[PDB]
Curated annotation (Swiss-Prot), chain A:
Keywords: Acetylation, Cytoplasm, Nucleus, Ribonucleoprotein, Ribosomal protein, Ribosome biogenesis, rRNA processing. Present with 29600 molecules/cell in log phase SD medium. It comes from the Eukaryota. Gene3D superfamilies: Ribosomal protein S11. The keyword Transferase does not apply. The lineage of its organism: Eukaryota, Fungi, Dikarya, Ascomycota, Saccharomycotina. This is Small ribosomal subunit protein uS11A. PANTHER family: 40S RIBOSOMAL PROTEIN S14/30S RIBOSOMAL PROTEIN S11. NCBIfam families: PRK09607.1. Component of the small ribosomal subunit (SSU). Mature yeast ribosomes consist of a small (40S) and a large (60S) subunit. The 40S small subunit contains 1 molecule of ribosomal RNA (18S rRNA) and 33 different proteins (encoded by 57 genes). The large 60S subunit contains 3 rRNA molecules (25S, 5.8S and 5S rRNA) and 46 different proteins (encoded by 81 genes). uS11 interacts with eS1 forming part of the mRNA exit tunnel. uS11 interacts with snoRNA U3. uS11 interacts with MPP10. Component of the ribosomal small subunit (SSU) processome composed of at least 40 protein subunits and snoRNA U3. It comes from Saccharomyces cerevisiae (strain ATCC 204508 / S288c) (Baker's yeast). GO terms for cellular component: 90S preribosome; cytosol; cytosolic small ribosomal subunit; nucleolus; nucleoplasm; small-subunit processome.
Curated annotation (Swiss-Prot), chain B:
Coiled coil: none annotated. PANTHER family: 40S RIBOSOMAL PROTEIN S3A (PTHR11830). One of its GO terms (biological process) is cytoplasmic translation. This is Small ribosomal subunit protein eS1A. One of its GO terms (cellular component) is 90S preribosome. Disulfide bonds: none annotated.
Amino acid sequence: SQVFGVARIYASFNDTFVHVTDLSGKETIARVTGGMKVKADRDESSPYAAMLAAQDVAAKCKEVGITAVHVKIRATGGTRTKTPGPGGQAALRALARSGLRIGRIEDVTPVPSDSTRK
Amino acid sequence: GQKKRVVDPFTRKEWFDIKAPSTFENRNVGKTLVNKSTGLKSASDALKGRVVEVCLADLQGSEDHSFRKIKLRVDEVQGKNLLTNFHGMDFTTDKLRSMVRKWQTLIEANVTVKTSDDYVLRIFAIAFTRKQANQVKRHSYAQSSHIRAIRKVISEILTKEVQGSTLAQLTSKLIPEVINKEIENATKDIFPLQNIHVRKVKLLKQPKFDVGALMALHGEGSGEEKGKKV
RNA sequence: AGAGGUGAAAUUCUUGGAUUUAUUGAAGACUAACUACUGCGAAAGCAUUUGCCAAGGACGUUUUCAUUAAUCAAGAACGCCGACUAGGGAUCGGGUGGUGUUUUUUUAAUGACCCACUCGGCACCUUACGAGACUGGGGGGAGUAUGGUCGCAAGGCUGAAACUUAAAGGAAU
């Protein structure tokens, strides 16, 4: 009965991205980042900004007809921090609070597997 | 400068749903957007390249496949249905991070094998050295010649499990994790080896299309539809 | 319709679509977790697979030669101590024996673990007993005084001195 998108929450420091696409990932439904909701240019990563971004994400997903999302939560990864910023749990909580059902939370940050440091 | 005015792009979007191949259980996996089928980029060829990443638990009803996501590649569109075929397999990262422990060795192998079709697959394997029950030393390392011999028999018997399978036969073989049981039985002569897994299957080349083979993987179908009433 | 980034910012990119997402290609590196008071190497050092090329060490040996040996100035290649007793636990490589479980069978040989012994290693924790006799340098630590020598430093509204001199500024108000 549910229609499933995916969440693609990329929560670095300095910013968060709440970007629902379809089940493939080819077609996007309301990418809104954290720094476009309220910008003091340093509160972009804040839980308030992630809650605002996930809330109007869930507005447009209920508009299009998506009832549930599979959550893919990633950090900046690479040769860098690998820990999700303060916005990841806030964006997930606001997506669940704003009507969308949550399924399949998974951690898809890019572990660099022998990287390019030195 | 001047940027753009918006015109709502969800009025030109069309909903298809994805029918999985019949080497699985319940095969309606979800839906997919595409732009509306106009001339000059019809929607049925705006599709046909998309892979979707589904969970094998969602494809098989159970929860012991809660890891092991798979990829399904859209091949043929008919009647607002996307018929898919197998495109790959991958663990989640948390599964193999949950498997790796210090004071053991991980033997990992991979082989590039061409099946009984002309699909060529890079297929991987991981295995971790167990300790026996009554073992009192804390290490249980393999002596690296046991690693070379274990990796040798892993490569030989899983390249025997491919070439002796098609894609549908290999997929139905690696759903109930039984190539892992073949590796375990063939390798307990050398080292104990807890939790052998396949962990990753990549398509490299795919032969041709063969709509008949895809529709025999799914089921038949042909339409004479409605007629205009004037 | 912003993205980096910062303690905040900024240089930078961006409606000729940045960042995010999906598919794919190319490049140059690198070999994550496994990874250890573990291994190997003469040292610097060495971590993906498979193969080839030579090498090396320890062990096993009722094999062989028979003193062929040890140390280092010169030269060449690469780049709490000792001459000292016993131990103890753990670990790496080899060997012998035991006799249980994983293994298993008439295709080849080949494991893993447990225990005792033994040889050789990287360490660790202890014990007993010994004379162990890219070269150039003033003289302890913490301070104290200074009628010596060498320095640096004060004055006093600026303008403004030969001129009791303008404008403007300062200060106190």
